[PDB]
């Protein structure tokens, strides 16, 4: 089997992408953020405490034939940027882009932090990193590619995100219209749960290029790319103006400015980021201050190859039974 679905950005900046998954019988569409540096599925949902909902599609489980409590469980997550969620846990069919997993765990929320309630366009999220992480409990559940592995043509899934436009995720199959030359394959280590990989180095704008390791995730959830201080730094220094806002959270930048590429090593293939995929625009309405896309991330303990870099890429999350990773660009 093989499934196709197109994921759009949920505003003008591509903070993040929703894509449309149908769970239960009839389907209730509920559009969620695929995140590959996670690995629960979990829905607002007509149990989520009303307060916390606004706007949001909400899963009803007692509306869908094929939803059965799965007694006892319950899960609780919290995610990098500090927001969280948690509730219990329904067993229902999930289908995206035409493929289908029955028995798929289906996290209900009771409870979601201020930061979910604020955003309307998003109704959950999707896990995609490996199972090892799921938060259910006490018995943890498999992500959706994890069950629909087996059935899959072959045991993959792409994101091709777009840049200020929509992209597809793809399950069971490589489409080889979808990215120029070739893909280069790269090695990943499951150890933190992650699809964690190892950068061969960078270059900023046209100049040369770095050979260096950066060990990082593929996390399509995450909108920013987020590095070592020391290259995020090398970045800023050749955009006049620019410079480190503690007041903010990070770096920011004239929005007069044009902002240089930058590449990223896959052994020895290169992606490169152009300059406008790095402004996020003005830090408040009508500022001349503009965020910026690469961060430092000394702070966070793992360097992130968050939408900014991956959106850059046609990229394969190889689910054979020594994952990797592949890149091209497209």
């Known amino acids: 089997s093989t499934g196709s679905a197109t ?3 949920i505003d003008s900046l591509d903070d993040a992408y929703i894509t449309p998954v149908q769970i239960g019988t009839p389907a209730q569409t509920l559009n969620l953020d695929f995140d590959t540096g996670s690995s629960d599925l979990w829905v607002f949902s007509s ?26 469980a319950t899960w609780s997550i919290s995610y990098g940027d500090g927001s969280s969620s948690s509730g219990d846990v329904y067993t229902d069919t999930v289908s995206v882009g035409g493929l289908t997993v029955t028995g798929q765990a289906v996290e209900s929320a009771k409870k979601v932090s ?29 992500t959706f590619f994890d069950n629909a592995k087996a059935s899959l043509d072959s045991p993959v899934f792409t994101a091709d995100l777009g840049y200020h436009a ?6 069971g199959f490589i ?44 996390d399509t959830g995450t909108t920013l790319l987020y590095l070592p201080a020391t290259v995020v730094s090398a970045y800023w220094a050749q955009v006049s103006g620019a410079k480190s ?7 920011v930048f004239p929005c007069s400015a044009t902002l240089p590429s930058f590449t990223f090593g896959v052994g020895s293939a290169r992606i490169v980021i152009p300059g406008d995929y790095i402004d996020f625009g003005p830090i408040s309405t009508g ?14 303990g793992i360097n992130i190859f968050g939408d ?23």
């Open 175 to 218: 489409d080889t219209t979808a990215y120029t030359g070739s893909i280069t394959y790269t090695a990943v280590s499951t150890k933190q749960g992650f699809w964690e990989w190892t950068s061969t180095g960078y270059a900023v704008g046209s100049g040369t290029f770095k050979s260096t390791s950066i060990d990082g995730i593929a």
């Open 287 to 300: 500022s001349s201050s503009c965020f910026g896309g690469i961060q430092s991330s000394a702070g966070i």
């Open 47 to 72: 149990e989520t405490t009303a307060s916390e909902v606004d706007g949001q599609t909400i899963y009803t489980p007692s509306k869908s034939t094929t939803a059965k409590l799965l007694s006892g």
């Open 245 to 251: 806002s503690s007041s903010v959270g990070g770096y």
């Open 114 to 142: 201020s930061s979910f309630t604020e955003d309307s366009t998003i109704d959950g999220l999707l896990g995609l990193a490996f199972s090892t992480l799921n938060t259910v409990s006490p018995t943890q559940q498999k």
């Open 308 to 330: 900014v870099a991956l959106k850059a890429a046609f990229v394969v999350f190889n689910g054979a039974t020594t994952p990797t990773l592949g890149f091209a660009s497209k």
């Open 166 to 171: 929509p992209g597809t995720y793809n399950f």
């Open 7 to 9: 994921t759009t950005p």
